[PDB]
Design a protein around this ligand. Sequence first.
Ligand SMILES: CCCCCCCCCCCCO[C@@H]1O[C@H](CO)[C@@H](O[C@H]2O[C@H](CO)[C@@H](O)[C@H](O)[C@H]2O)[C@H](O)[C@H]1O
Ligand SMILES: COc1nc(C(=O)[C@H]2C[C@@H]2C(=O)O)ncc1N(CC1CC1)c1cccc2ccccc12
Ligand SMILES: COc1nc(C(=O)[C@H]2C[C@@H]2C(=O)O)ncc1N(CC1CC1)c1cccc2ccccc12
Ligand SMILES: COc1nc(C(=O)[C@H]2C[C@@H]2C(=O)O)ncc1N(CC1CC1)c1cccc2ccccc12
Ligand SMILES: CCCCCCCCCCCCCCCC(=O)O
Ligand SMILES: CCCCCCCCCCCCCCCC(=O)O
Ligand SMILES: CCCCCCCCCCCCCCCC(=O)O
Ligand SMILES: CCCCCCCCCCCCCCCC(=O)O
Ligand code: NI
Ligand code: NI
Ligand code: NI
Lengths: 149, 148, 149
Amino acid sequence: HHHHHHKDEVALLAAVTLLGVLLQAYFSLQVISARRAFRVSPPLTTGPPEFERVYRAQVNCSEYFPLFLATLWVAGIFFHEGAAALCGLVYLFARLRYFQGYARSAQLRLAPLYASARALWLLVALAALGLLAHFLPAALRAALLGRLR
Amino acid sequence: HHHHHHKDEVALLAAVTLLGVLLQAYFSLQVISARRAFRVSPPLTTGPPEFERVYRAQVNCSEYFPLFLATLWVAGIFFHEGAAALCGLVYLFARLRYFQGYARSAQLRLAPLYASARALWLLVALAALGLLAHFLPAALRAALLGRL
Amino acid sequence: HHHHHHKDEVALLAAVTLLGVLLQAYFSLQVISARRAFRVSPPLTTGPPEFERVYRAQVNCSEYFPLFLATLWVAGIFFHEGAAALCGLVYLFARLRYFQGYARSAQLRLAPLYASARALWLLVALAALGLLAHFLPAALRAALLGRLR
Ligand SMILES: CCCCCCCCCCCCO[C@@H]1O[C@H](CO)[C@@H](O[C@H]2O[C@H](CO)[C@@H](O)[C@H](O)[C@H]2O)[C@H](O)[C@H]1O
Ligand SMILES: COc1nc(C(=O)[C@H]2C[C@@H]2C(=O)O)ncc1N(CC1CC1)c1cccc2ccccc12
Ligand SMILES: COc1nc(C(=O)[C@H]2C[C@@H]2C(=O)O)ncc1N(CC1CC1)c1cccc2ccccc12
Ligand SMILES: COc1nc(C(=O)[C@H]2C[C@@H]2C(=O)O)ncc1N(CC1CC1)c1cccc2ccccc12
Ligand SMILES: CCCCCCCCCCCCCCCC(=O)O
Ligand SMILES: CCCCCCCCCCCCCCCC(=O)O
Ligand SMILES: CCCCCCCCCCCCCCCC(=O)O
Ligand SMILES: CCCCCCCCCCCCCCCC(=O)O
Ligand code: NI
Ligand code: NI
Ligand code: NI
């Protein structure tokens, strides 16, 4: 126990984070359901194209999920909670469309893939700007103090 | 520096996290050892079924690891540290049995897989309840104030 | 809102985290570029060895990213911010060399792979020591108080 909590500075980030977990659960579910429909038994990860695209979509979302996370949280703490959470949401909605697109074809994944990438770059930029705002003043000051002597 | 630290509210979550890291290390070690026994040289990922099942078991535990993490932390902060840590432990022990099961066969993976899924779902539910507790009162209040 | 922030205790961790995200971006970019040069269209993940090595290097770095993250943060918070950040940087730089090595051959990946593993074990050790320093005193004290009664 302390007599204050910082929950209330990260609750939006936490909500978006959870939403991302749930979205991954939906993607796994679709993979399970593709495994049944095209009869691809674990441990195999190859099969008909229609299976491979679903499986790949899920794998690519899972692999980007930690990156999404890390940049969400850095942006949301160093830049602005609300703005990070919102880019997060745009990221997740884009990945849902990416997943749906890819299921249909390689080509129909592209537009939402690009939109996923833009939303993730926005998170990167907000995180970077936030970190710059945190470190740049002291560093400029130290450099000016050095030249002043 | 501040004159207080919040470490002590997250130390169980941190211990469980690290335990999870160590478990992944054990899984990688088994994969390395299966690569030697069945002579599957990187960058190959395919080979005899006994190699593929170990390899897949590891890749599936790696891929769910961040999900475990995220929910572990959200649940532990917004619901209850101890309860989240404990579900976490149950998740990790279930994955260790899943890994061992899968090595032996596709079929023996299933019971511990299901247990691992139940444990993760519990973490999800805790995280969701914790977030509901945080947001719901102010939202109901704002709505009541609007109607007044 | 609050009248203190803990940003300034984790800014180095956050910066190393973001550097890690950027490095994964660089790795993906090399994968895209290898897909074009060797004509391997998603959803395929197999192709000429030169493509497979790049692709594997990227996958292995993505899969260890969250482990790196988790241990970076636990070490940075329970042991020492600066020392964790520094081992983080050595981890990332080694993975860059691992990636470049692996692109050229299976064999050239090994030295920087071993350096990546050492740097991650150091983070694991710093995390474990920090957790020990947090829990061990109260536990020893409780055990002694029990025997004293
Ligand atoms: C070391 C630090 C490195 C930092 C690097 C940072 C790079 C930052 C790049 C940000 C790229 C943002 O680019 C911008 O993305 C948005 C969001 O999709 C696009 O917006 C687009 O999507 C939205 C839907 O969500 C619609 O309004 C419309 O379809 C379109 O305008 C812009 O058309 C594009 O120009
Ligand atoms: C541990 O959770 C899960 N693990 C696995 C495997 O590890 C499978 C691939 C390995 C194999 O076949 O051996 N699969 C499904 C799992 N579920 C089920 C959910 C999809 C309906 C899940 C339960 C709770 C939350 C979740 C969040 C995201 C994804 C899933 C969540
Ligand atoms: C960076 O650490 C490791 N990286 C890789 C690769 O990236 C391999 C797949 C790439 C290739 O072969 O090209 N493999 C094994 C690694 N080890 C050592 C292992 C004995 C447990 C590890 C060292 C330190 C901590 C760890 C934690 C979890 C898993 C592993 C940890
Ligand atoms: C979501 O961002 C990205 N996603 C994907 C896929 O999910 C691909 C594998 C799926 C497929 O082809 O179906 N690829 C590239 C992406 N970019 C592009 C950037 C690297 C040049 C990225 C944008 C912003 C930050 C980033 C950080 C790391 C990696 C990438 C970052
Ligand atoms: C991947 C998600 C990681 C989330 C990390 C969030 C940690 C910030 C909160 C500090 C912990 C203390 C806040 C008081 C809450 C409590 O313990 O009751
Ligand atoms: C939108 C978020 C809500 C998600 C709710 C997830 C449901 C929790 C399911 C838990 C079922 C586990 C059954 C108990 C385990 C056992 O019998 O040993
Ligand atoms: C994804 C792995 C977990 C991320 C963990 C973030 C937890 C942040 C806890 C609050 C940080 C402030 C306390 C700093 C203590 C110190 O530096 O001495
Ligand atoms: C339960 C916690 C286990 C901790 C295991 C830690 C293993 C640490 C090994 C570090 C080896 C460092 C040797 C480096 C030599 C060099 O880099 O030049
Ligand atoms: Ni008190
Ligand atoms: Ni002071
Ligand atoms: Ni505080």
